Amino acid sequence: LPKPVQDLIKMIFDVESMKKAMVEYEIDLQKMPLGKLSKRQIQAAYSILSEVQQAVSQSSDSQILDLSNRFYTLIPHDFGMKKPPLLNNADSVQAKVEMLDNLLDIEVAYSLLRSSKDPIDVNYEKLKTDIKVVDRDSEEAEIIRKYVKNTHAYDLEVIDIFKIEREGECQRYKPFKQLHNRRLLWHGSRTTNFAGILSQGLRIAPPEAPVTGYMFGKGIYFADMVSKSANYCHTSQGDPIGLILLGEVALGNMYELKHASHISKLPKGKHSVKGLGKTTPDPSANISLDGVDVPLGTGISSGVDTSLLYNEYIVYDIAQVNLKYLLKLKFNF
Amino acid sequence: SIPLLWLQNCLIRAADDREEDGCSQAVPLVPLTEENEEAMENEQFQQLLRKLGVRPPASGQETFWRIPAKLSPTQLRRAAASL
C-alpha cells in the first residue's frame, strides 16, 4: 500500500492514542483499561444519562447524587483531588453524551484490533474501505484545496487527500441520489474515531442516548466551512495533525433553524435540519459536480436573528450520507 | 389514496429496478410531501405496510421504512396490485 495510506492506518489504529483520548476525558485508565471498554457498559451509561435528562426536567439532590454515582461506577473517572462532579444539569448531560460518543468509537476501533501479512495490510482490510491517494495535481485535489482554503488561530494545510469508498455504502446511498439538494460537506472528528467511522460509517447516537445531549438532536452533523468542522478534530500544538471527512449528503427539504433544538423527529416533509449561521460560503461561487453542490466560496455575511456562527447540516437517517474523501490536515499554530 | 398511489408506484418501480438490475437492495420509502409522511406515521397505514412486506426503520439509525431486498419483482407486483 502507498506510504500515505500506511501512515493513515497506523495513526487511526494507534492504541496509545486511544488511551490518551480516554485520559483526556478524565477516565480512570487503571480502573478501566482500554481493553475492558464494552458496548454493553456504554449503552447502559447512555441510559443513565437519559435518566439524568428526565430527572433534570422534573428533582432532588440525592437522586442526582445516586445517578451520578451510578454513572461513575459504570464509567470510572479520575478526578484527582476534586470531589466527583454531580450530573446536575443539561450541560453535564451534553458533556457526558459527547464523551460516550467518542468512547463508543474507540471501543469499535479496539475491537477491530481484536504472520500472514504485514500488520498494516491486515488492519487496512479490517476497515472494509477502499482508500486511494488522490493525486495532488488532479482537478479533484484542486477543488478540495480551494474548499479548504476559502472556508478557512490556526491556519490550515492539506497534507494528504484520500478517496474513500466504504463497502456497501454506494448501494445504500444510491436511492437518495433521487433526492434533491445534495451537498458535499465537512465532517470533522477525533483521529481515534476514524477506524470506527470507516468500518461502520457515520452513525447516529442510540435510542438510549439522551436527545438533550445533542444541539439538534440525534442525527449526523456536517458543516459547509472547514474551520467549523476543524474544531471537532480537537487538535493541539503538541500534536498538530487532524483528519476530516468530505461527504455527499442528500439533504432534501431542509428544516431551517436559528437556535439549538433537540429534535426527536423532523416535521412532516422535511429531510434534514439546516442551522443558519452568521457566516456562509459566498453562494455566488458555488459549483455543481454532477448535481452535487460544493459551496467553496469564501465566507461572507449571511444576513440572517441567529445564535450560530456557521451553518450546520443534520440528517437523521444514516443512509443519507456517502463518504467521499478523507483529508489529513496540518494545523499550524 | 394519494399516499396509497405513491406506495403502489414505489412498489412497482422497485419491482422494475430489481428485475432490470438483476440484483436487489433494500429501498427506502422516501416521502417527499407532508401528507405522504403523515400517512407513514399513521397506525392503519403502517399495518398495511407490514402486511405488504415493508419493514419499519431500524431503531436509532433510520427513519425511513424499507422495501426489503428479499422481495422479488413478483411479490412486489402482487403487493401493488392488491391495493
Curated annotation (Swiss-Prot), chain A:
Impact noted for substituting residue 195 to S/L: Increased DNA-independent poly-ADP-ribosyltransferase activity
Transmembrane stretches, start-end:
none
Q: Where in the cell is it found?
A: Cytoplasm
**Covalent link Glycyl lysine isopeptide (Lys-Gly) (interchain with G-Cter in SUMO2), residues:** 83
Outcome following mutation: residue 207 to G: Does not affect DNA-independent poly-ADP-ribosyltransferase activity
Impact of changing residue 196 to S on the protein?
A: Does not affect DNA-independent poly-ADP-ribosyltransferase activity
Question: What outcome is documented for mutating residue 218 to I in this protein?
Answer: Abolishes enzymatic activity
Q: Where is the PARP catalytic domain?
A: 118-333
Active site positions: 312 (for poly [adp-ribose] polymerase activity)
Glycyl lysine isopeptide (Lys-Gly) (interchain with G-Cter in SUMO1) cross-link, chain position(s): 83
Q: What is the effect of changing residue 210 to G/S?
A: Does not affect DNA-independent poly-ADP-ribosyltransferase activity
Q: How does it assemble?
A: Interacts (when auto-poly-ADP-ribosylated) with AIFM1.
What name does this protein carry? Answer: Poly [ADP-ribose] polymerase 1, processed C-terminus
Source organism of this protein record: Homo sapiens
- Tell me the classification of the organism that encodes this protein: Eukaryota, Metazoa, Chordata, Craniata, Vertebrata
Report which gene this protein is encoded by: PARP1
Curated annotation (Swiss-Prot), chain B:
What is its subcellular localisation?
A: Nucleus; Chromosome
Residue(s) carrying Phosphothreonine: 74
Q: Which domain of life is it from?
A: Eukaryota
Positions of the UniProt region annotated as Interaction with PARP1:
1-83
Factors inducing expression: Regulated by the cell cycle. High levels in S, G(2) and M phases, with highest level in S phase. Low expression in G(0) and G(1) phases.
Q: Which residues carry this modification: Phosphoserine?
A: 59, 72
Tissue expression profile of the protein: Expressed in all tissues examined including brain, heart, lung, liver, skeletal muscle, kidney, placenta, pancreas, spleen, thymus and testis. Highest levels of expression in placenta, pancreas, thymus and testis.
Residues folding into a coiled coil are none
Q: What family does the database annotate? A: Belongs to the timeless family.
Record's function text: Plays an important role in the control of DNA replication, maintenance of replication fork stability, maintenance of genome stability throughout normal DNA replication, DNA repair and in the regulation of the circadian clock. Required to stabilize replication forks during DNA replication by forming a complex with TIPIN: this complex regulates DNA replication processes under both normal and stress conditions, stabilizes replication forks and influences both CHEK1 phosphorylation and the intra-S phase checkpoint in response to genotoxic stress.
> Tell me, how does this one assemble?
Monomer. Homodimer or homomultimer. Component of the circadian core oscillator, which includes the CRY proteins, CLOCK or NPAS2, ARTNL/BMAL1 or ARTNL2/BMAL2, CSKN1D and/or CSNK1E, TIMELESS, and the PER proteins. Interacts with PER2. The interaction with PER2 is direct and via its second PAS domain. Interacts directly with PER1 and PER3. Interacts with CRY2, CHEK1, ATR and ATRIP. Interacts with CRY1. Interacts with CLSPN; the interaction is required for leading-strand replication. Interacts (via N-terminus) with TIPIN.
Q: Related disease?
A: Advanced sleep phase syndrome, familial, 4: An autosomal dominant disorder characterized by very early sleep onset and offset. Individuals are 'morning larks' with a 4 hours advance of the sleep, temperature and melatonin rhythms.
The record's note on its domains: Residues 1182-1199 comprise a putative nuclear localization signal; nuclear localization is required for the regulation of period length of the circadian clock. The DNA-binding domain (residues 816-954) binds to both single-stranded DNA (ssDNA) and double-stranded DNA (dsDNA), and has high affinity for DNA sequences rich in guanine that form G-quadruplex (G4) structures.
Protein name per the record? Protein timeless homolog
Q: What is the phylogenetic placement of the source species in the record?
A: Eukaryota, Metazoa, Chordata, Craniata, Vertebrata
Q: Which residues of the full protein are shown?
A: 1016 to 1098 of 1208
